A paper describes a structure:
The expression of sar-BGC is controlled by a divergently transcribed quorum-sensing system that is composed of a leaderless communication peptide (LCP), NRPS-inducing peptide (NIP), and its cognate cytosolic receptor, NRPS regulator (NrpR). NIP is expressed during high bacterial population density, secreted, reimported into the cytosol, and recognized by NrpR, which leads to upregulation of sar-BGC. During environmental acidification, SAL cytosol is acidified, which is sensed by a pH-sensitive histidine switch in the cytosolic transcription regulator, NrpR. The protonation of histidine during cytosolic acidification promotes high-affinity interactions between NrpR and its cognate intercellular signaling peptide, NIP, which leads to upregulation of sar-BGC expression.
To elucidate the molecular mechanism of pH sensing by NrpR, we determined the crystal structure of cytosolic receptor NrpR (amino acids 1–285) to 2.6 Å resolution, the first full-length structure of an LCP receptor. The crystal belonged to the I21 space group, and each asymmetric unit has an NrpR dimer. The overall architecture of NrpR is similar to the DNA-binding members of the RRNPPA family of regulators. Each NrpR subunit is composed of 17 α-helices and has two distinct functional domains: an amino-terminal DNA-binding domain (helices α1–α4) with a classical helix-turn-helix (HTH) DNA-binding motif and a C-terminal helical domain (CTD) (helices α6–α17) that has the characteristic tetratricopeptide repeat (TPR) motif-containing domain. The two domains are connected by a linker helix α5. The TPR motifs form a super-helical structure in the CTD with an exposed concave surface. The putative NIP-binding pocket of NrpR is lined by the helices α6, α10, α12, α14, and α15. Contrary to this, the side chain of H144 is located at the bottom of the predicted NIP-binding pocket of NrpR and positioned to influence NrpR-NIP interactions in response to pH alterations. Since NrpR was crystallized under neutral pH conditions, the crystal structure failed to divulge the pH-dependent allosteric changes in NrpR that lead to transcription activation of sar-BGC.
Residue numbers in the entry:
A (entry chain A), B (entry chain A): 1 to 285
Protein backbone atom coordinates (compact mmCIF):
# COMPACT_ATOMS: atom_id res chain seq x y z
CA UNK A 1 0.00 0.00 0.00
CA UNK A 2 1.59 3.35 -1.16
CA UNK A 3 2.37 6.18 1.41
CA UNK A 4 -0.58 8.39 0.26
CA UNK A 5 -3.27 5.80 1.22
CA UNK A 6 -1.61 4.85 4.58
CA UNK A 7 -1.36 8.53 5.75
CA UNK A 8 -5.04 9.19 4.87
CA UNK A 9 -6.21 5.87 6.46
CA UNK A 10 -4.33 6.87 9.70
CA UNK A 11 -5.76 10.46 9.41
CA UNK A 12 -9.40 9.18 9.21
CA UNK A 13 -8.88 6.40 11.85
CA UNK A 14 -7.70 9.19 14.26
CA UNK A 15 -10.51 11.59 13.10
CA UNK A 16 -7.97 14.32 12.07
CA UNK A 17 -8.57 17.09 9.47
CA UNK A 18 -6.32 17.67 6.38
CA UNK A 19 -5.61 21.19 7.85
CA UNK A 20 -4.66 19.72 11.31
CA UNK A 21 -2.01 17.45 9.63
CA UNK A 22 -0.97 19.57 6.56
CA UNK A 23 -0.86 22.72 8.79
CA UNK A 24 0.70 25.42 6.54
CA UNK A 25 3.39 23.10 5.06
CA UNK A 26 1.23 21.27 2.42
CA UNK A 27 -1.70 22.35 0.09
CA UNK A 28 -4.99 20.35 -0.17
CA UNK A 29 -4.21 19.83 -3.94
CA UNK A 30 -0.65 18.70 -3.03
CA UNK A 31 -2.09 16.48 -0.17
CA UNK A 32 -4.84 14.90 -2.43
CA UNK A 33 -2.50 14.04 -5.38
CA UNK A 34 -0.08 12.46 -2.81
CA UNK A 35 -3.02 10.32 -1.48
CA UNK A 36 -3.80 9.08 -5.05
CA UNK A 37 -0.08 8.34 -5.76
CA UNK A 38 0.14 11.11 -8.47
CA UNK A 39 2.96 13.11 -6.67
CA UNK A 40 5.63 12.27 -4.04
CA UNK A 41 6.45 14.66 -1.13
CA UNK A 42 9.79 15.90 0.31
CA UNK A 43 11.01 13.64 3.23
CA UNK A 44 10.76 16.57 5.77
CA UNK A 45 7.04 16.90 4.73
CA UNK A 46 6.34 13.14 5.18
CA UNK A 47 7.86 13.23 8.73
CA UNK A 48 5.80 16.44 9.34
CA UNK A 49 2.61 14.56 8.34
CA UNK A 50 3.51 11.49 10.52
CA UNK A 51 4.43 13.87 13.42
CA UNK A 52 0.92 15.51 13.24
CA UNK A 53 -0.72 11.99 12.91
CA UNK A 54 1.04 11.18 16.23
CA UNK A 55 2.47 8.02 14.49
CA UNK A 56 6.13 6.74 14.45
CA UNK A 57 7.77 6.03 11.05
CA UNK A 58 8.54 2.39 12.01
CA UNK A 59 4.77 1.99 12.88
CA UNK A 60 3.97 3.78 9.59
CA UNK A 61 6.21 1.50 7.41
CA UNK A 62 4.88 -1.63 9.20
CA UNK A 63 1.35 -0.59 7.90
CA UNK A 64 2.49 0.28 4.31
CA UNK A 65 3.98 -3.29 4.08
CA UNK A 66 0.53 -4.80 4.91
CA UNK A 67 1.36 -5.45 8.63
CA UNK A 68 4.66 -7.31 7.93
CA UNK A 69 8.36 -6.69 8.82
CA UNK A 70 10.58 -5.91 5.74
CA UNK A 71 11.33 -8.91 3.38
CA UNK A 72 15.17 -8.86 4.10
CA UNK A 73 14.69 -9.32 7.92
CA UNK A 74 11.97 -11.99 7.42
CA UNK A 75 14.18 -13.79 4.79
CA UNK A 76 17.03 -13.64 7.45
CA UNK A 77 14.94 -15.50 10.10
CA UNK A 78 13.85 -18.10 7.46
CA UNK A 79 17.60 -18.55 6.60
CA UNK A 80 18.32 -19.11 10.36
CA UNK A 81 15.62 -21.85 10.70
CA UNK A 82 16.43 -23.54 7.33
CA UNK A 83 20.13 -23.94 8.43
CA UNK A 84 19.16 -25.17 11.96
CA UNK A 85 16.86 -27.87 10.44
CA UNK A 86 19.24 -28.85 7.53
CA UNK A 87 16.54 -27.59 4.99
CA UNK A 88 18.74 -27.45 1.81
CA UNK A 89 15.46 -26.84 -0.18
CA UNK A 90 14.42 -23.54 1.51
CA UNK A 91 18.07 -22.39 1.38
CA UNK A 92 18.32 -23.38 -2.33
CA UNK A 93 14.92 -21.63 -2.98
CA UNK A 94 16.06 -18.34 -1.18
CA UNK A 95 19.38 -18.57 -3.20
CA UNK A 96 17.33 -18.50 -6.52
CA UNK A 97 15.38 -15.31 -5.49
CA UNK A 98 18.57 -13.38 -4.48
CA UNK A 99 20.62 -14.79 -7.44
CA UNK A 100 19.72 -11.47 -9.23
CA UNK A 101 22.28 -9.74 -6.85
CA UNK A 102 21.06 -6.27 -8.03
CA UNK A 103 22.56 -4.38 -4.98
CA UNK A 104 24.90 -4.88 -1.89
CA UNK A 105 21.87 -6.13 0.15
CA UNK A 106 21.24 -9.02 -2.36
CA UNK A 107 25.05 -9.86 -2.50
CA UNK A 108 25.36 -10.21 1.34
CA UNK A 109 22.33 -12.54 1.68
CA UNK A 110 23.37 -14.44 -1.52
CA UNK A 111 26.82 -14.97 0.03
CA UNK A 112 25.18 -15.89 3.38
CA UNK A 113 22.88 -18.57 1.72
CA UNK A 114 25.77 -19.98 -0.44
CA UNK A 115 28.10 -20.14 2.64
CA UNK A 116 25.45 -21.94 4.78
CA UNK A 117 24.70 -24.35 1.83
CA UNK A 118 28.50 -24.93 1.55
CA UNK A 119 28.56 -26.03 5.21
CA UNK A 120 25.58 -28.46 4.60
CA UNK A 121 27.01 -30.08 1.38
CA UNK A 122 30.76 -29.91 2.48
CA UNK A 123 31.63 -27.70 -0.58
CA UNK A 124 33.90 -24.61 -0.86
CA UNK A 125 32.15 -21.16 -1.01
CA UNK A 126 35.53 -19.36 -0.71
CA UNK A 127 34.34 -16.29 -2.78
CA UNK A 128 31.11 -15.87 -0.69
CA UNK A 129 32.65 -16.15 2.80
CA UNK A 130 35.17 -13.49 1.56
CA UNK A 131 32.27 -11.11 0.51
CA UNK A 132 30.69 -11.56 4.03
CA UNK A 133 34.01 -11.16 5.97
CA UNK A 134 34.97 -7.94 4.05
CA UNK A 135 31.49 -6.37 4.55
CA UNK A 136 31.50 -7.05 8.36
CA UNK A 137 35.18 -6.14 9.10
CA UNK A 138 34.63 -2.56 7.70
CA UNK A 139 31.51 -1.62 9.83
CA UNK A 140 32.34 1.32 12.22
CA UNK A 141 28.59 2.12 12.74
CA UNK A 142 27.04 -1.30 13.54
CA UNK A 143 23.23 -1.31 13.00
CA UNK A 144 20.45 -3.96 13.43
CA UNK A 145 21.13 -5.31 9.83
CA UNK A 146 24.71 -6.37 10.73
CA UNK A 147 23.48 -7.85 14.09
CA UNK A 148 20.83 -10.00 12.25
CA UNK A 149 23.51 -10.86 9.61
CA UNK A 150 26.16 -11.72 12.29
CA UNK A 151 23.83 -13.99 14.46
CA UNK A 152 23.30 -15.90 11.18
CA UNK A 153 26.93 -15.94 9.79
CA UNK A 154 28.80 -16.12 13.13
CA UNK A 155 29.68 -19.84 13.23
CA UNK A 156 31.23 -20.04 9.67
CA UNK A 157 34.01 -17.64 11.00
CA UNK A 158 37.16 -18.55 13.00
CA UNK A 159 37.19 -17.35 16.65
CA UNK A 160 39.88 -14.60 16.01
CA UNK A 161 37.41 -12.97 13.55
CA UNK A 162 34.44 -13.23 15.96
CA UNK A 163 36.64 -11.78 18.78
CA UNK A 164 37.72 -9.00 16.34
CA UNK A 165 34.04 -8.14 15.57
CA UNK A 166 32.99 -8.33 19.29
CA UNK A 167 35.83 -6.04 20.59
CA UNK A 168 35.18 -3.56 17.71
CA UNK A 169 31.37 -3.01 18.33
CA UNK A 170 31.22 -2.62 22.18
CA UNK A 171 31.10 1.22 21.74
CA UNK A 172 28.28 2.04 19.16
CA UNK A 173 26.31 -1.02 20.55
CA UNK A 174 26.21 0.94 23.87
CA UNK A 175 25.11 4.26 22.18
CA UNK A 176 21.70 2.74 21.16
CA UNK A 177 21.26 1.02 24.62
CA UNK A 178 18.12 3.31 24.83
CA UNK A 179 17.01 1.81 21.45
CA UNK A 180 13.97 -0.49 21.63
CA UNK A 181 14.48 -4.12 20.47
CA UNK A 182 18.08 -3.10 19.37
CA UNK A 183 19.99 -2.81 22.69
CA UNK A 184 18.25 -6.15 23.45
CA UNK A 185 19.15 -7.78 20.06
CA UNK A 186 22.82 -6.72 20.64
CA UNK A 187 22.81 -8.67 23.99
CA UNK A 188 21.19 -11.78 22.40
CA UNK A 189 24.01 -11.84 19.77
CA UNK A 190 26.62 -11.66 22.67
CA UNK A 191 24.90 -14.72 24.29
CA UNK A 192 25.12 -16.46 20.84
CA UNK A 193 28.89 -15.65 20.83
CA UNK A 194 29.29 -16.96 24.43
CA UNK A 195 27.32 -20.10 23.42
CA UNK A 196 29.52 -20.58 20.32
CA UNK A 197 32.78 -20.03 22.32
CA UNK A 198 31.64 -22.42 25.15
CA UNK A 199 30.64 -24.94 22.35
CA UNK A 200 34.16 -24.58 20.74
CA UNK A 201 35.79 -25.34 24.16
CA UNK A 202 37.20 -21.73 23.84
CA UNK A 203 36.13 -20.81 27.45
CA UNK A 204 38.78 -18.03 27.62
CA UNK A 205 36.92 -15.67 25.12
CA UNK A 206 33.47 -16.66 26.60
CA UNK A 207 34.63 -15.21 30.02
CA UNK A 208 35.80 -11.96 28.29
CA UNK A 209 32.56 -11.76 26.17
CA UNK A 210 30.28 -12.27 29.22
CA UNK A 211 32.17 -9.71 31.41
CA UNK A 212 31.59 -7.15 28.57
CA UNK A 213 27.83 -8.11 28.34
CA UNK A 214 27.57 -7.55 32.15
CA UNK A 215 29.10 -4.00 31.79
CA UNK A 216 26.42 -3.20 29.10
CA UNK A 217 23.80 -0.95 30.82
CA UNK A 218 20.68 -3.28 31.02
CA UNK A 219 17.22 -1.96 32.12
CA UNK A 220 15.60 -4.14 34.87
CA UNK A 221 12.58 -4.99 32.56
CA UNK A 222 15.02 -6.70 30.06
CA UNK A 223 14.43 -10.02 31.94
CA UNK A 224 15.08 -12.52 29.11
CA UNK A 225 18.49 -10.81 28.58
CA UNK A 226 19.38 -10.46 32.36
CA UNK A 227 18.33 -14.20 32.75
CA UNK A 228 20.68 -15.19 29.85
CA UNK A 229 23.54 -13.12 31.42
CA UNK A 230 23.03 -14.88 34.84
CA UNK A 231 22.44 -18.38 33.37
CA UNK A 232 25.60 -18.32 31.13
CA UNK A 233 27.75 -16.77 33.96
CA UNK A 234 26.81 -19.76 36.26
CA UNK A 235 27.48 -22.08 33.25
CA UNK A 236 31.03 -20.56 33.09
CA UNK A 237 31.39 -20.99 36.91
CA UNK A 238 30.24 -24.68 36.54
CA UNK A 239 33.04 -25.21 33.91
CA UNK A 240 35.50 -23.75 36.53
CA UNK A 241 34.00 -26.35 38.98
CA UNK A 242 31.13 -25.36 41.35
CA UNK A 243 27.98 -27.60 41.67
CA UNK A 244 26.58 -24.57 43.67
CA UNK A 245 25.98 -22.94 40.22
CA UNK A 246 23.86 -25.94 38.94
CA UNK A 247 20.95 -25.08 41.39
CA UNK A 248 20.92 -21.44 40.04
CA UNK A 249 20.76 -22.75 36.37
CA UNK A 250 17.85 -25.12 37.30
CA UNK A 251 15.93 -22.31 39.18
CA UNK A 252 16.21 -20.01 36.09
CA UNK A 253 14.83 -22.99 34.02
CA UNK A 254 11.98 -23.48 36.59
CA UNK A 255 11.03 -19.75 36.39
CA UNK A 256 10.73 -19.84 32.53
CA UNK A 257 8.34 -22.87 33.06
CA UNK A 258 6.39 -20.97 35.85
CA UNK A 259 5.63 -18.00 33.50
CA UNK A 260 4.73 -20.16 30.44
CA UNK A 261 8.01 -19.62 28.48
CA UNK A 262 7.77 -23.45 28.06
CA UNK A 263 9.58 -23.61 24.63
CA UNK A 264 12.52 -21.47 26.02
CA UNK A 265 12.63 -23.49 29.33
CA UNK A 266 13.02 -26.70 27.17
CA UNK A 267 15.85 -25.06 25.04
CA UNK A 268 17.78 -24.23 28.26
CA UNK A 269 16.80 -27.70 29.75
CA UNK A 270 18.34 -29.45 26.60
CA UNK A 271 21.45 -27.13 26.70
CA UNK A 272 22.33 -27.83 30.39
CA UNK A 273 21.76 -31.64 29.78
CA UNK A 274 24.00 -31.33 26.62
CA UNK A 275 26.54 -29.32 28.76
CA UNK A 276 26.77 -31.90 31.63
CA UNK A 277 27.08 -34.69 28.94
CA UNK A 278 30.14 -33.06 27.21
CA UNK A 279 31.83 -31.83 30.46
CA UNK A 280 30.85 -34.50 33.09
CA UNK A 281 33.06 -32.92 35.85
CA UNK A 282 30.36 -30.13 36.25
CA UNK A 283 27.98 -32.42 38.25
CA UNK A 284 30.79 -34.56 39.80
CA UNK A 285 29.51 -35.10 43.41
CA UNK B 1 21.86 17.06 12.76
CA UNK B 2 20.09 17.38 9.31
CA UNK B 3 19.32 14.22 7.16
CA UNK B 4 22.12 14.97 4.61
CA UNK B 5 24.95 14.72 7.21
CA UNK B 6 23.50 11.59 8.96
CA UNK B 7 23.16 9.62 5.64
CA UNK B 8 26.77 10.48 4.62
CA UNK B 9 28.14 9.71 8.15
CA UNK B 10 26.38 6.25 7.97
CA UNK B 11 27.66 5.80 4.34
CA UNK B 12 31.33 6.42 5.37
CA UNK B 13 31.05 4.44 8.68
CA UNK B 14 29.88 1.43 6.55
CA UNK B 15 32.53 2.14 3.82
CA UNK B 16 29.84 2.45 1.06
CA UNK B 17 30.21 4.39 -2.24
CA UNK B 18 27.79 7.18 -3.37
CA UNK B 19 27.01 4.95 -6.45
CA UNK B 20 26.29 1.86 -4.21
CA UNK B 21 23.65 3.89 -2.23
CA UNK B 22 22.38 6.38 -4.92
CA UNK B 23 22.26 3.51 -7.50
CA UNK B 24 20.49 5.04 -10.55
CA UNK B 25 17.82 6.89 -8.47
CA UNK B 26 19.92 9.95 -7.38
CA UNK B 27 22.69 12.10 -9.09
CA UNK B 28 26.03 12.92 -7.36
CA UNK B 29 25.09 16.68 -7.64
CA UNK B 30 21.63 15.90 -6.16
CA UNK B 31 23.29 13.66 -3.44
CA UNK B 32 25.98 16.33 -2.53
CA UNK B 33 23.54 19.29 -2.22
CA UNK B 34 21.31 17.05 -0.01
CA UNK B 35 24.40 16.34 2.23
CA UNK B 36 25.05 20.12 2.62
CA UNK B 37 21.33 20.83 3.37
CA UNK B 38 20.86 22.85 0.08
CA UNK B 39 18.06 20.55 -1.33
CA UNK B 40 15.56 18.06 0.20
CA UNK B 41 14.79 14.66 -1.46
CA UNK B 42 11.48 12.86 -2.19
CA UNK B 43 10.50 10.47 0.71
CA UNK B 44 10.75 7.35 -1.60
CA UNK B 45 14.40 8.44 -2.33
CA UNK B 46 15.27 8.86 1.40
CA UNK B 47 13.93 5.32 2.16
CA UNK B 48 15.88 4.10 -0.94
CA UNK B 49 19.09 5.61 0.52
CA UNK B 50 18.42 4.13 4.03
CA UNK B 51 17.55 0.74 2.39
CA UNK B 52 20.98 0.69 0.59
CA UNK B 53 22.74 1.86 3.87
CA UNK B 54 21.17 -1.27 5.47
CA UNK B 55 19.78 1.07 8.23
CA UNK B 56 16.18 1.25 9.66
CA UNK B 57 14.41 4.66 9.68
CA UNK B 58 13.83 4.50 13.48
CA UNK B 59 17.64 3.87 13.87
CA UNK B 60 18.21 6.72 11.37
CA UNK B 61 15.97 9.26 13.23
CA UNK B 62 17.50 8.26 16.60
CA UNK B 63 20.92 9.43 15.13
CA UNK B 64 19.57 12.70 13.56
CA UNK B 65 18.22 13.65 17.05
CA UNK B 66 21.76 13.31 18.54
CA UNK B 67 21.13 9.80 20.02
CA UNK B 68 17.88 10.77 21.85
CA UNK B 69 14.20 9.62 21.62
CA UNK B 70 11.81 12.35 20.29
CA UNK B 71 11.06 15.29 22.74
CA UNK B 72 7.26 14.42 23.03
CA UNK B 73 7.95 10.83 24.30
CA UNK B 74 10.75 12.01 26.66
CA UNK B 75 8.48 14.88 27.94
CA UNK B 76 5.75 12.14 28.52
CA UNK B 77 8.05 10.06 30.81
CA UNK B 78 9.11 13.24 32.70
CA UNK B 79 5.34 14.03 33.14
CA UNK B 80 4.83 10.47 34.55
CA UNK B 81 7.65 10.85 37.16
CA UNK B 82 6.74 14.48 38.11
CA UNK B 83 3.12 13.35 38.91
CA UNK B 84 4.30 10.21 40.84
CA UNK B 85 6.63 12.38 43.03
CA UNK B 86 4.15 15.34 43.46
CA UNK B 87 6.68 17.64 41.55
CA UNK B 88 4.32 20.62 40.82
CA UNK B 89 7.46 22.56 39.63
CA UNK B 90 8.46 20.22 36.74
CA UNK B 91 4.76 19.95 35.77
CA UNK B 92 4.38 23.77 35.93
CA UNK B 93 7.67 24.15 33.91
CA UNK B 94 6.49 21.63 31.16
CA UNK B 95 3.09 23.53 31.11
CA UNK B 96 4.97 26.82 30.21
CA UNK B 97 6.84 25.19 27.23
CA UNK B 98 3.63 23.65 25.73
CA UNK B 99 1.49 26.77 26.55
CA UNK B 100 2.17 27.81 22.88
CA UNK B 101 -0.34 25.01 21.85
CA UNK B 102 0.69 25.45 18.14
CA UNK B 103 -0.73 21.99 17.04
CA UNK B 104 -2.90 19.00 18.32
CA UNK B 105 0.27 17.41 19.83
CA UNK B 106 0.89 20.52 22.07
CA UNK B 107 -2.88 20.69 23.04
CA UNK B 108 -2.99 17.02 24.24
CA UNK B 109 0.14 17.31 26.44
CA UNK B 110 -0.97 20.81 27.64
CA UNK B 111 -4.32 19.29 28.67
CA UNK B 112 -2.48 16.29 30.22
CA UNK B 113 -0.17 18.59 32.35
CA UNK B 114 -3.10 20.89 33.40
CA UNK B 115 -5.27 17.84 34.34
CA UNK B 116 -2.45 16.25 36.43
CA UNK B 117 -1.75 19.69 38.10
CA UNK B 118 -5.54 19.94 38.78
CA UNK B 119 -5.37 16.61 40.67
CA UNK B 120 -2.34 17.86 42.75
CA UNK B 121 -3.86 21.30 43.69
CA UNK B 122 -7.55 20.04 43.95
CA UNK B 123 -8.66 22.50 41.18
CA UNK B 124 -11.06 22.01 38.21
CA UNK B 125 -9.46 21.46 34.73
CA UNK B 126 -12.88 20.64 33.21
CA UNK B 127 -11.92 22.02 29.70
CA UNK B 128 -8.61 20.02 29.60
CA UNK B 129 -9.96 16.62 30.71
CA UNK B 130 -12.64 17.14 27.96
CA UNK B 131 -9.89 17.75 25.28
CA UNK B 132 -8.12 14.48 26.41
CA UNK B 133 -11.35 12.37 26.60
CA UNK B 134 -12.54 13.49 23.09
CA UNK B 135 -9.10 12.80 21.51
CA UNK B 136 -8.90 9.24 23.00
CA UNK B 137 -12.56 8.17 22.46
CA UNK B 138 -12.23 8.77 18.63
CA UNK B 139 -9.04 6.60 18.04
CA UNK B 140 -9.88 3.59 15.73
CA UNK B 141 -6.14 3.05 14.88
CA UNK B 142 -4.41 3.09 18.31
CA UNK B 143 -0.64 3.77 18.02
CA UNK B 144 2.26 4.04 20.56
CA UNK B 145 1.46 7.82 21.12
CA UNK B 146 -2.03 7.04 22.53
CA UNK B 147 -0.58 4.14 24.64
CA UNK B 148 2.06 6.51 26.21
CA UNK B 149 -0.71 9.17 26.60
CA UNK B 150 -3.20 6.65 28.15
CA UNK B 151 -0.68 5.12 30.72
CA UNK B 152 -0.23 8.76 31.84
CA UNK B 153 -3.91 9.99 31.75
CA UNK B 154 -5.62 6.69 32.75
CA UNK B 155 -6.34 7.38 36.44
CA UNK B 156 -8.05 10.84 35.94
CA UNK B 157 -10.86 8.90 34.02
CA UNK B 158 -13.87 7.03 35.50
CA UNK B 159 -13.77 3.20 35.13
CA UNK B 160 -16.59 3.12 32.45
CA UNK B 161 -14.31 5.26 30.20
CA UNK B 162 -11.22 3.08 30.84
CA UNK B 163 -13.33 -0.07 30.14
CA UNK B 164 -14.64 1.65 26.96
CA UNK B 165 -11.04 2.35 25.77
CA UNK B 166 -9.80 -1.19 26.71
CA UNK B 167 -12.66 -3.07 24.91
CA UNK B 168 -12.25 -0.79 21.82
CA UNK B 169 -8.44 -1.37 21.24
CA UNK B 170 -8.11 -5.20 21.69
CA UNK B 171 -8.17 -5.61 17.85
CA UNK B 172 -5.51 -3.17 16.35
CA UNK B 173 -3.36 -3.77 19.54
CA UNK B 174 -3.17 -7.44 18.35
CA UNK B 175 -2.29 -6.48 14.69
CA UNK B 176 1.13 -5.02 15.79
CA UNK B 177 1.81 -8.00 18.19
CA UNK B 178 4.86 -8.58 15.85
CA UNK B 179 5.86 -4.91 16.52
CA UNK B 180 9.00 -4.46 18.66
CA UNK B 181 8.57 -2.55 21.96
CA UNK B 182 4.88 -1.84 20.91
CA UNK B 183 3.13 -5.22 21.44
CA UNK B 184 5.03 -5.15 24.78
CA UNK B 185 4.03 -1.52 25.67
CA UNK B 186 0.36 -2.47 24.95
CA UNK B 187 0.61 -5.30 27.58
CA UNK B 188 2.26 -2.99 30.18
CA UNK B 189 -0.68 -0.54 29.81
CA UNK B 190 -3.15 -3.50 30.39
CA UNK B 191 -1.23 -4.34 33.65
CA UNK B 192 -1.55 -0.60 34.59
CA UNK B 193 -5.34 -0.92 33.98
CA UNK B 194 -5.52 -4.15 36.07
CA UNK B 195 -3.47 -2.40 38.81
CA UNK B 196 -5.81 0.64 38.71
CA UNK B 197 -8.98 -1.56 38.77
CA UNK B 198 -7.61 -3.74 41.66
CA UNK B 199 -6.66 -0.42 43.46
CA UNK B 200 -10.26 0.94 42.92
CA UNK B 201 -11.69 -2.29 44.49
CA UNK B 202 -13.25 -2.83 40.98
CA UNK B 203 -12.04 -6.51 40.82
CA UNK B 204 -14.79 -7.40 38.27
CA UNK B 205 -13.15 -5.41 35.34
CA UNK B 206 -9.59 -6.49 36.45
CA UNK B 207 -10.64 -10.19 35.85
CA UNK B 208 -12.02 -9.27 32.36
CA UNK B 209 -8.90 -7.12 31.54
CA UNK B 210 -6.46 -9.90 32.59
CA UNK B 211 -8.34 -12.66 30.67
CA UNK B 212 -7.99 -10.44 27.53
CA UNK B 213 -4.22 -9.86 28.23
CA UNK B 214 -3.79 -13.69 28.50
CA UNK B 215 -5.47 -14.17 25.04
CA UNK B 216 -2.97 -11.63 23.54
CA UNK B 217 -0.35 -13.69 21.60
CA UNK B 218 2.87 -13.25 23.76
CA UNK B 219 6.32 -14.48 22.54
CA UNK B 220 8.16 -16.62 25.19
CA UNK B 221 11.09 -14.06 25.37
CA UNK B 222 8.60 -11.34 26.60
CA UNK B 223 9.40 -12.42 30.22
CA UNK B 224 8.72 -9.13 32.07
CA UNK B 225 5.23 -9.13 30.46
CA UNK B 226 4.51 -12.92 30.99
CA UNK B 227 5.72 -12.44 34.67
CA UNK B 228 3.27 -9.49 35.12
CA UNK B 229 0.41 -11.58 33.57
CA UNK B 230 1.16 -14.51 36.01
CA UNK B 231 1.81 -12.27 39.08
CA UNK B 232 -1.46 -10.24 38.68
CA UNK B 233 -3.52 -13.42 37.90
CA UNK B 234 -2.35 -14.96 41.26
CA UNK B 235 -3.08 -11.54 42.90
CA UNK B 236 -6.69 -11.86 41.56
CA UNK B 237 -6.84 -15.50 42.83
CA UNK B 238 -5.57 -14.28 46.29
CA UNK B 239 -8.47 -11.71 46.37
CA UNK B 240 -10.86 -14.69 45.64
CA UNK B 241 -9.14 -16.43 48.64
CA UNK B 242 -6.19 -18.85 48.05
CA UNK B 243 -2.95 -18.55 50.15
CA UNK B 244 -1.57 -21.11 47.57
CA UNK B 245 -1.20 -18.09 45.19
CA UNK B 246 0.97 -16.10 47.73
CA UNK B 247 3.95 -18.56 47.29
CA UNK B 248 3.78 -18.04 43.45
CA UNK B 249 3.81 -14.18 43.91
CA UNK B 250 6.85 -14.44 46.28
CA UNK B 251 8.75 -16.82 43.86
CA UNK B 252 8.23 -14.33 40.96
CA UNK B 253 9.62 -11.60 43.33
CA UNK B 254 12.61 -13.88 44.24
CA UNK B 255 13.40 -14.47 40.52
CA UNK B 256 13.52 -10.68 39.74
CA UNK B 257 16.04 -10.43 42.69
CA UNK B 258 18.05 -13.49 41.36
CA UNK B 259 18.58 -11.83 37.91
CA UNK B 260 19.41 -8.34 39.31
CA UNK B 261 16.02 -6.67 38.51
CA UNK B 262 16.39 -5.41 42.13
CA UNK B 263 14.43 -2.11 41.63
CA UNK B 264 11.47 -4.05 39.99
CA UNK B 265 11.61 -6.83 42.69
CA UNK B 266 11.24 -4.03 45.37
CA UNK B 267 8.25 -2.43 43.44
CA UNK B 268 6.44 -5.83 43.43
CA UNK B 269 7.63 -6.47 47.09
CA UNK B 270 6.01 -3.08 48.18
CA UNK B 271 2.81 -3.81 46.09
CA UNK B 272 2.14 -7.28 47.62
CA UNK B 273 2.83 -5.83 51.18
CA UNK B 274 0.43 -2.90 50.29
CA UNK B 275 -2.07 -5.53 48.92
CA UNK B 276 -2.07 -7.76 52.09
CA UNK B 277 -2.40 -4.54 54.23
CA UNK B 278 -5.60 -3.33 52.41
CA UNK B 279 -7.17 -6.84 52.00
CA UNK B 280 -5.96 -8.78 55.14
CA UNK B 281 -8.10 -11.90 54.31
CA UNK B 282 -5.49 -12.80 51.54
CA UNK B 283 -2.93 -14.15 54.10
CA UNK B 284 -5.57 -15.29 56.66
CA UNK B 285 -4.10 -18.64 57.91
Amino acid sequence: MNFGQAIDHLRRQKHFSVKQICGNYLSRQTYYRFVNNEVDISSTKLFYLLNHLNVNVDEFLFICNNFQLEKEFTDMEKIKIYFEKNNIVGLQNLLTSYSSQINVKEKIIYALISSLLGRLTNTSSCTEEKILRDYLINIETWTHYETVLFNNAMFIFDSEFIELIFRKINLNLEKYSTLRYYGNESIRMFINMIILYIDRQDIRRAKEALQIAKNFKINDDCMYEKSCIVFFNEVLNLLNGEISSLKICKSIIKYFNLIGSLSIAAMFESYLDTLIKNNPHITFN
